[PDB]
Amino acid sequence: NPFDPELYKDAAVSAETRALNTALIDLLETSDDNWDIGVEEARARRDRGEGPFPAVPKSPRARTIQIPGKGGDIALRIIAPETPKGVYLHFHGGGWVFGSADGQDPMLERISDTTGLVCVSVEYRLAPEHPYPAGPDDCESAALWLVENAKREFGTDLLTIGGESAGGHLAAVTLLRMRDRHGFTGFAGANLVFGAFDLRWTPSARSYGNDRYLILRTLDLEKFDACFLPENVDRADPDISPLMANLHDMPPALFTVGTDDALLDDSLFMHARWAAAGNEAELAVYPGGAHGFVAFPGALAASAVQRMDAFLKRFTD
Ligand SMILES: [Cl-]
Secondary structure (H helix, E strand, C coil): CCCHHHCCCCCCCCHHHHHHHHHHHHHHHHHHHHHHHHHHHHHHHHHHCCCCCCCCCCCCCCEEEEECCCCCEEEEEEEEECCCCEEEEEECCCCCCCCCCCCHHHHHHHHHHHHHEEEEHHHHHHCCCCCCCCHHHHHHEEEEEEECCCCCCCCCCCCCEECHHHHHHHHHHHHHHHHHHHHHEEEEEEEECCCCCCCCCCCCHCCCCCCCCCCCCCHHHHHHHHHHCCCCCCCCCCCCCCCHCCCCCCCCCCEEEEEEEEHHHHHHHHHHHHHCCCCCEEEEEEEEEEECCCCCCCCHHHHHHHHHHHHHHHHCC
């Protein structure tokens, strides 16, 4: 199914999806570029709800747990059911530069209500103020804290992980760190939503181009790279590009991606290697889907959401 070539042709893109993408492109090309206004101003504009996209409401159910990290306290954002059936450890996207733990409360609340999972979203340090390995260090600190304390805090030891884009990257990096550095392979499932797994940039990431500002341009990836990775690094390092890693004994994973995404190849490649290492692996490909398409209205996003939430719910009983 996800390798049906028809899935990748223009004909498979619904009228609704094409129209949404066209409007998003226009919206983004009309508004000031984030790289033109600079990082801090771009964050500040999103903060006061002034960005291309309308602000995202915060849940009154959200509460915060400060845990210790290498660079100080790390904020863990919590949305919990009355009786948690497990934990969803979540990492926001934003190219290791933008986004926040409190930037997607509606989604987290939806996940928690449907799955019965307590959602824990991590405020990991952001580049370029705090380049690699700061972000990954904080995500590892969170995962470690959960393994140690989830029973006490939430009355459960069932752990899942997930994230969008750079958050998907971080989810994979964190899984591999927990296995390699701490001998822990106890996560039950991984929700990897259009993540970046090869920071050398896969073919589709290099060739997507900038002529069409559909959420994510090749330019954006190049800028994220410059912020996140010091000159000192080797992008082939498995801690930097999880696609390069030995993937043995990883949890079941769902890879969710649209065909109109610069990072398409990242999900296709990571899926293939995930399966080839002997793990359970599902690839869900959505025709015409933009990068970040699951946040938008419309039937295509709704279908991806149903699939992802059902995937997470599976690991609870
Ligand atoms: Cl066609």
